[PDB]
Design a protein around this ligand. Sequence first.
Ligand SMILES: Nc1c(Cl)ncnc1N1CCCC1
Lengths: 237, 300
Amino acid sequence: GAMNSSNYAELFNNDIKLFVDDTNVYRVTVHKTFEGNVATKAINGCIFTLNPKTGHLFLKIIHTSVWAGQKRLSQLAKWKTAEEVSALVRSLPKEEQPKQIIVTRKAMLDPLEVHMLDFPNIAIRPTELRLPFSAAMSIDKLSDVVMKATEPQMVLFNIYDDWLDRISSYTAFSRLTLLLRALKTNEESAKMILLSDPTITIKSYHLWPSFTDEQWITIESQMRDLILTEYGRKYNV
Amino acid sequence: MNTVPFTSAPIEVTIGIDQYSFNVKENQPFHGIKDIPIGHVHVIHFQHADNSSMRYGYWFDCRMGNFYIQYDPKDGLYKMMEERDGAKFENIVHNFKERQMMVSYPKIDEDDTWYNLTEFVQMDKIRKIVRKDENQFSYVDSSMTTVQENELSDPAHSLNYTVINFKSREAIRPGHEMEDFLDKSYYLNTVMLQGIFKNSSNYFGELQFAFLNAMFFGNYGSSLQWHAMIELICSSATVPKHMLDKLDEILYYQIKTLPEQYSDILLNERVWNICLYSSFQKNSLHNTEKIMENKYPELL
Ligand SMILES: Nc1c(Cl)ncnc1N1CCCC1
């Protein structure tokens, strides 16, 4: 059944699982036509497929050519997502295939279930959590590789950098969701926080700055302030 | 016009014959039903006064033998029985019609309801859904489960309806996942019609039999089967024009006949709203949509 606050720790057990977020698969800019009508122009997207235990991110880049000549693109996007997730699973050795796939939006359930009929023992699950994975395109290196792609492409990342050398998965996932929740509520402030001290750098093979343990506590603190605030700035409290 | 005589009526019971029903008191002098129209299947069904639990009954075709109903005090039900002695059946029956101890199948001559509900229902197909081959007639009751229900326990007592499952490899061609799930025409026309049922008549016959078991026995798995077979047609973009026209007639008469007070459990809101208002065939069921809107507009 559904994944929620009550069974949260199952994410960090030793059963292979993947979150799949489709919120950035089909992306458009809306604009005016010379005739003064409105039209959309698609831009490159991505499927965000994440192992929450190991941090491995399978970033399938969805190139705008996928949409050429297609109708009902928002519906196709869910089926294209499920097709690419199914292809990824089939590509993995049996002992690496997930035992569960958790979709962040319930509209992915039937598309994924149908594409995974060949895998009756992989559980397809929704979640009651409001996870902030739409903000993954606020991570500069992820956004960059998506926008630069000229063809379909899979790029592999560890979204936890080297954190697991020092902290547990649970803690690493909590840091990740706080960072992304911040970036989603106010991207400018979020990003200001992360790059204020120029002495702290992002290694070439990482996504986030090389904070010391003590600097992470400060950073984490500042992100919670932002979220509380923006929640005030938004609701006036 | 044929006859299903009764040995007796030792327990108080509501007896149905097709869409008609009458109350028989305990030990009332009742010895059966006469003037049954030849050429159609029929169902004779029972609800005891003392236990409205378990409606049960028998599908039969008088052309296939001489049948009588005898109460069994051990198993506690009215049993259908086939008499092989045609003279002894005749001898027993002549006594009953002379003493006027039979009710008459009360067919109004203008009325085509039963024909329209059983148009495609054959006894030979019923007997493959209900497996009990030593008898020419078929028992059904409220509790019997379907093969598909048993998948998700006693198989001898099952309803072997054709398994329909929209999220199944049978339903979904590899590489046409989205196409086959959103437009079920290949599952309808190739898998089911051309492959399993062979023609639309057999498909409609199973659809009609499932509805009738749902209506007369409140058989839940039958109601599931009826709705699934409707939904498979409505969710297909490509349906032969003769099938859609006949489907509209079939469903019109089913909805017309349904008890006004049973629509709450026997009609699945989602299937009907999808079929009448969203599906490919939303525009192809004019008579059915009219009677649904004028009779069950709440459901919609
Ligand atoms: N043959 C019968 C007919 Cl036609 N109607 C009623 N009872 C019958 N049985 C004969 C054996 C015991 C009861």
